[PDB]
Amino acid sequence: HMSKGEELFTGVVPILVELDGDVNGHKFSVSGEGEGDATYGKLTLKFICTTGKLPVPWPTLVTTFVQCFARYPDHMKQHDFFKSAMPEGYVQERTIFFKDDGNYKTRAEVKFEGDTLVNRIELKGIDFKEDGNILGHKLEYNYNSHNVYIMADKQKNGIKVNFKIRHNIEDGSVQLADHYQQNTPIGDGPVLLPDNHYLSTQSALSKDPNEKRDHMVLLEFVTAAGIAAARNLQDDLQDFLALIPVDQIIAIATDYLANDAEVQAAVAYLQSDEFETIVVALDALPELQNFLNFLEANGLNAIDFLNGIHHIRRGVGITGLIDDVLAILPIEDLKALFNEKLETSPDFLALYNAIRSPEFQSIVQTLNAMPEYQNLLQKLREKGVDVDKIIELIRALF
Numbered sequence: 001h002m003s004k005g006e007e008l009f010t011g012v013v014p015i016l017v018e019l020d021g022d023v024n025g026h027k028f029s030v031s032g033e034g035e036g037d038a039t040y041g042k043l044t045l046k047f048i049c050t051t052g053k054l055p056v057p058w059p060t061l062v063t064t065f066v067q068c069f070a071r072y073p074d075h076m077k078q079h080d081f082f083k084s085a086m087p088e089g090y091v092q093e094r095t096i097f098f099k100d101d102g103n104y105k106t107r108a109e110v111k112f113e114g115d116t117l118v119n120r121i122e123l124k125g126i127d128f129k130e131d132g133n134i135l136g137h138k139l140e141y142n143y144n145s146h147n148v149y150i151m152a153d154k155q156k157n158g159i160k161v162n163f164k165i166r167h168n169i170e171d172g173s174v175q176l177a178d179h180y181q182q183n184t185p186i187g188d189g190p191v192l193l194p195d196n197h198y199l200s201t202q203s204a205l206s207k208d209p210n211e212k213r214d215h216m217v218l219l220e221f222v223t224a225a226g227i228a229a230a231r232n233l234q235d236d237l238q239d240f241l242a243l244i245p246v247d248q249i250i251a252i253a254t255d256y257l258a259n260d261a262e263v264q265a266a267v268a269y270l271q272s273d274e275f276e277t278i279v280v281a282l283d284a285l286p287e288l289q290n291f292l293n294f295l296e297a298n299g300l301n302a303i304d305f306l307n308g309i310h311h312i313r314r315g316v317g318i319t320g321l322i323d324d325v326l327a328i329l330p331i332e333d334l335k336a337l338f339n340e341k342l343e344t345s346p347d348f349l350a351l352y353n354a355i356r357s358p359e360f361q362s363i364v365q366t367l368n369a370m371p372e373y374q375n376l377l378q379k380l381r382e383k384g385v386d387v388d389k390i391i392e393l394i395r396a397l398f
């Protein structure tokens, strides 16, 4: 946890919105309620105009009507100012310019009152063309996707935000609305001041088919981005698995293990005492240890994997298993990803170099000299597995 405020958003939260506004002197009030869930970066709000008719289009109000509900990924959690200002909350102020038309100025307080997150807003519009897209109610009822750009304002102990909303017009044109935003802590407690990043925002406007009153149902999905997480061998591994249909493979293996005698025999051999001698002797090698530690320090849980290691079938025996898995793997692609990571990943190249090191090859040579290992290979060659070919293929990668 990177802040105390952050812990308030783990679950679903009640939301309340109140707005008072005046646009070209048309005065109105709106109230809304719903729930945010910041884990998923979702929120759901319903609004009603309590004064009678809304003098401006619902879509123009969307941005005005709780960014503390964005989903920040774990690597970005030190960059979330919004949750960090909670519960005391923050002031969010904006100027919104509608191209070729009037502008909105807004001031909102966002903060908890009890268990509820409350957004109270005052809004003033001016200089609107009476025949324009806004007063003329020419906007389609819908919303688009936008990136919301955040940067720290140190002087103000807060953030500066800007973005451009695209409002679709009924004649197929687009009405731009340039947003300039600042957010300020209400409380005197410490807050996170983020590096430059953005919120990816998606929204959808709908109705309650039952609701008779003019209303807007608003659905928002918001996720922070624009800052790369630190990378290591985990991330490289995940990338190879990504290329691999692991579900199919795990199933095929499961099947052979169930219905095939030879596959079961080889598994029995894995708990065999001859095989035990092999594991034991390798585990005894200091250079094997160093290699494991190396993997550990670079993001791999290695020891965890090894110590913790204990009908689609188209084929028969070990070769049947090997062939079925192979038919599945994208060899050319994996091989490409492998070549690429030697270029683009430092950790992966160190890993490669580590394996090619004299230290490591001596682990390999120790193994090659175990007659119990040499016997294991012969046990396979006689079951039809071409080990020598497979062995050469691997030598050739390195």
Ligand SMILES: CCCCCCCCCCCC
Pocket: 278, 279, 282, 283, 306
């Ligand atoms: C206990 C950690 C040692 C792991 C050694 C694995 C040896 C695998 C050899 C298999 C040869 C095909």
Ligand SMILES: [Cl-]
Pocket: 093, 094, 095, 180, 181, 182
């Ligand atoms: Cl401003």
Ligand SMILES: [Cl-]
Pocket: 105, 106, 107, 122, 123, 124
């Ligand atoms: Cl105002």
